Amino acid sequence: IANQPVVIDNGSGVIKAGFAGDQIPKYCFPNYVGRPKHVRVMAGALEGDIFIGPKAEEHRGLLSIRYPMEHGIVKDWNDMERIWQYVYSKEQLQTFSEEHPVLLTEAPLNPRKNRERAAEVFFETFNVPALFISMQAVLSLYATGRTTGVVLDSGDGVTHAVPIYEGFAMPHSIMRIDIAGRDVSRFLRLYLRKEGYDFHSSSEFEIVKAIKERACYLSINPQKDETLETEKAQYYLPDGSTIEIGPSRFRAPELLFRPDLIGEESEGIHEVLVFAIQKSDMDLRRTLFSNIVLSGGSTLFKGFGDRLLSEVKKLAPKDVKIRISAPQERLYSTWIGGSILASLDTFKKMWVSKKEYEEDGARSIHRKTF
Template sequence: MTREEATALQLPFPIHKGLITNLDQIESLWSHLLHLDLRIDPAEHPILLTEPALPPPPLRAKSAELLFERFHAPALYLSSQATLSMYASGKIYPSVVVDIGEEVSSVVPLYNEHVLEGGVVQLEVSGGDLTEFLMGVLNAQGYVFGSSWERLLAREMKESLGCVALDHAEALRGAPAQDYCLPDGQVVRVGGEGLHCAEALFQPSLVGRSCFGVHEGIHEAINRCDVDIRRELYGKIILVGGSTLFKGFSDRLSKELFALAPCGMRLHICAAPERRYSSWIGGSILGSLSTFQSMFITQEEYDEIGPVIVNRRCY
């Protein structure tokens, strides 16, 4: 897509903060994906739908209604992204999934494959906030970043150059600026503040938020869980989502958690290289298990009980 095309298009976004906000638009999007991209008849294929932690029950019911009644899916299952990411990690036992994506960030403790709802912590800073912060830094330097196209460029710049330091203040004092070449040949010089925009994941005040940093969110989520499983949770912290891929992120998180965790607590952070796609990978693993067939909600069960069945069977 060219800059002119991106600027001219009015693009709707039927999902906001991980939740469907426009069912008509999401129906059009799913129809395009299923019929034109995948070229399949959804009436012939069971569907696994991912969702963020603690989705509103009415929205889950509406999603089931759409897939069963408009797409005629023969079977359906809804699973949290955290649970699927646990499957992608290769082991199933008490764990904490730290998911930092473009719009949604959360800390989700899991036990026996189920979300411990009382321990879920929603973080207020995600990848999109870091992009906005970087755009503000660049605009202050005299560049112009404001359109949807320029936001896309800033996001790519963030993902290419962004990093997290063990000592943020020290890094800012000695960080040399780096050049980034835009598609039109313009060279943008990014200084230390922009290069370290991901520091806001640990210090939300940098983007105007008064909330937990990611390390504090993990500590809080574990402390909300039963004391008998906290040691196990500290020992299996799973990072997922594109905004955990910044260079130095895992090391900084380890440093901050060691400072917060009880003395002598063993910490282990799992940071798979492919963690941007953990939900998809976990979904493919779950879908291949023989036991998965018994988890599906069938069309017949939906017809008998109605949309509320998803809130009884999918948890």
């Protein structure tokens, strides 16, 4: 049973899906489960009472949105099962789970219990013929067409700098933080309350994400922007009322570089990138500096790459050629790589078959990934 395999690229913020050997993921939607706050009085209302994807985006105000996955670690397993069922259902894929092999993705260095429980869901609840979990950085390099280079990424949950050199993903040199787009959105929400405009509701939380996506920019010199007084630019909400954003827009994405502002000890994106290069061998450092690939949604801030280049110039040894490259479609970089990896004839060897899982168990899944 070697049908066209499916590539479900997981993520805390957004979840991508579709078939192998494709240019773009056809099925992209945000990873959450909306449920109705209000009392459904009238007959002929929205049926089901568990909303995922575009229906939930259309009907935000009704639904109490909650995310199942934080920092690449699922909290609510029943919610992720409903999301995966919605992916396979007629509203999105129009396929059965029994036909196609599965390509899953996860952030590196996660708890193994969650990886085991993920496999249990795919093999038992769904009747998958073969499963395969993989890295995000390895796929992003397959999407670009390079083998050597570091992959800095920044989704909604995790930020991790994975160094790879000619098909050798060093498991030891992988740096990681639990600081990312969701924490930046939460930090921007806190700043908007300091400005004046309070947002506490779960449906109203996605307006803060929309403001973060649209009206934000990362300054090169933060001390210079602190001394100067801001212009206070405007933005229209979904309702109609205008909001002067003020200094919150530029101080919000500083969290990624300065993790002390939220109140939690971490390295930072720029430190993690330097740190992933340093932990590798001495001969391979200069090739890793030359090939730095960006990925994820939280790398799309204005003057983000320029700030990363300046931070590398400050920390790294002098007289070294720095190059932070990036693809055009930074959001769909990991999925394209999975679609390429799935289309290859080698893919049959790597996967965990259902028969092999039934015989061995979790140990076979731990062996095949690394």
